[PDB]
């Protein structure tokens, strides 16, 4: 097989931002290795629901197959994880798309009786105890 | 947004139907209070 | 001979790397590391967040925890306690032991709490 | 009648729904026929070099539906198709269509 | 000003200037419709849309069957490797004197299929034919090691290749 | 009472016949209803200033709030159906 | 209250004009109560932000953002033109319990957003749920799908190139 | 009820739900104990003291002070404003309280949805360019186009989505750990809720968010 | 190109109509002219909007307080008085 030498590094510094933009001096080893520890923590925290795990065992006491399959996250589609540094601020940009999104923001005749006489004439119980001769 | 809604409770019991009517009535009483 | 040996396993313990502190949040209803100076500035912001906001909503946790820390650090705040004692009716006979310990612990040490607050 | 009015004899009676029409397009007007739509369908296969055994047994077992004889052998089909293979196409219609049976 | 209203200011593409032909459409569209007559023409309400560059062989009304004759496989030898050019062949025609043949060639049987049909429709011809007394005379056509012979008959006699019985009929040569 | 009526009507008619229909071929409701009725009293314990110590069996109190006759007069039904 | 809302809506249908500043739209509260949502989200700070701060001695801001792209609500021709071509894959697609609507979108998100991670996972959910006999056919339908149907979208999106080995 | 398409009586559990909601409306004594709210009076507005002079302010004040027993009645009244039945013929005395989408005469002669069914709940209608579905449709039809002999565009770029910010005021809303939502998770709420979400360690009054919103 | 070619031919098709179509009314005013260039150059009159919008100069946050104090000095206040409760809150709702 012919040798396809490293294309991306031949292109990066002059035509393409690397997968992250930060730079460092004397701490290249930490950041280069620590962000890699965070790329996958967040992936494995989102793509696998762990808030349901941290409840069951980490917390003391005083559905299961539904979670191991990650059925709740079947519509989740991450795109990237990004990192930055400036002004003492670490930053993270996470763009995620879902092809579906659920609703969570959430007997007529009974109205007609109590409002039959009109608009402002409501039928309270104290009226309907009565029976006019 | 902190002190706005209470004026609507106060200004009405005063003659001022709105907030600015307070200023319109207390123009000169308030003008003497200022010195520039 | 076994591997790892017990005398080895203490090395990783004495340095402290065997722990994972975010688990503590689920064990203790109050959790504020303050392991860094940035985290401490996060405390002072809360103290100014309250002085500026007269209209404010809470839960039983965030109230009691702030008092635990101000007591632990010893900061003087005659304005904070009167602002927060108003809501105490909201969580009568409801609070956890760990949280009930905090505001109790702070009401004594503050030398600023009310005789209603301690009650 | 809702159909056969709608296609042929509905333009006679249509209302004047006013419509904006660009003057540019109103010059190049040419009225003509283009194509019929019954014939927008696929083209369909017919393979009888290799699969002829499939067709014929399916054609014969259809022909059983008439019950000229209860027991269909390859003896009957021989004797029966000799005679019909004479007949003019007119005669072969009367045998299946204009019988005392039908 | 009037240009920028029309969006003609900067360049624009609204016309479809394609010559991609039409192939095997309406695989399932509401079955059929009732048979009606061809009396409602087209109007050129749009100076952008138009029926220029639309072949007749595709524009032909009536509908065809396609007939299989053979599929084969070939080989081309090279320095490194051998390559297989899959082949396919096909036939198609109405009962009314329309007919054609194509030669498919591709890297899959299903592709040589799709190619061969493209060739046939372009390779269509029309045969002289009267519905009344189709075949006046006998005929002979000899390709290599092969020869077909037709003689007229008042009735149709399909005894032979069941293929040719269809092909002769899918031209209209009923009297033979 | 809204929880009792679900218990008395729904969870019994299911758990009874489920166990019956299953026992021919071959516990949460008894307990979870007690998990819930033990919560309704707690708020009622707060109203009186009387802690959980008191038993807060519901129907003893509900009888005072509804003096309605549990059935209708038969003469009216004859009078109206007529 | 009921009589109010009609006169509200009938005003809304007619009075709305082109908004001047779109950045004002940021303040728009969600359908959910913005406080109620905030209750069910406060847990993450003590877990993640307050920890990720520990490992870095530095300030943080995390942005679980979404794409600015959205899709129409009405079926039209230009959806149906794709559905007719992508039919043989439906059998392969039902094995994965994946919908048809969603598959078309992710590719257009992919051709636009250019995120290798998204369209990859779509394959892996297909190529795994299938059996190891059938991978060969699925690609021949994928080759035609990209090569013929979606080759037209490239020049529009300033997009150019695909390769998969 | 049948002309509108109203359904039959619900299950016993939902009839028992209808029971107490009557009891709430039935056990009134005009007290905050029976309501759950204190007593107030309408804020006399600029255009006039009558509420319909400014129906908006009525809605604001009414929601803030709506008693518990009257909430479910309202939610049913919200439906009447939304139910748009269609017919070329309908009585006028009914027309006040519902809508008639006039069918075209001379008409008999001349939407995107899922395909799965295992989902518990149906979808959110995402934020459009504008609130009016019709005005959204008029705009989007100008965005769609034609590219390639058969394909086209059916998707648009959006105005900037809504957003949230969370800097250590998070704590105040926070609940205990002895009680937490075991059903619903934050990560799901982040996903299902529209817009975007932002945490950050905090700022001063004079300072700007680090990340562009 | 193709798109450049439509831009050519379509201008020819539209101008020919004007050759056949009657002359039409035409603009004269200088202000009316300048709007054309703005309609061409994609510029829009943005300056007119900020004239309306508020500034911290014109507000009144102190002049309220001066008037309220004139009321408290002028009017008697007690716990029974309905003004006493709202005003002492109002004072906090500025100084806070």
From TrEMBL, chain A:
Protein known as: Ribosomal protein S3
Positions of transmembrane segments: 76-97
Keyword Ribonucleoprotein recorded: yes
Recorded superkingdom: Eukaryota
Gene Ontology cellular component annotations, sorted alphabetically: ribosome
Keywords for the protein's UniProt record, in alphabetical order: Membrane, Mitochondrion, Ribonucleoprotein, Ribosomal protein, Transmembrane, Transmembrane helix
Organism expressing this protein natively: Tetrahymena thermophila
Gene coding for it: rps3
TrEMBL record, chain D:
Name listed for the protein in its UniProt record: Ymf76
Gene that specifies this protein: ymf76
TrEMBL record, chain G:
Keywords: Mitochondrion, Ribonucleoprotein, Ribosomal protein
GO cellular component, one term: ribosome
Domain of life according to the entry: Eukaryota
Protein family (similarity comment): Belongs to the universal ribosomal protein uS3 family.
Protein name: Ymf64
Protein species of origin: Tetrahymena thermophila
The encoding gene: ymf64
TrEMBL record, chain H:
Disordered: region residues: 106-127
Domain of life according to the entry: Eukaryota
Name listed for the protein in its UniProt record: Uncharacterized protein
Originating species: Tetrahymena thermophila (strain SB210)
Organism placement in taxonomy: Eukaryota, Sar, Alveolata, Ciliophora, Intramacronucleata
Shown stretch of the complete protein: 278 to 498 of 719
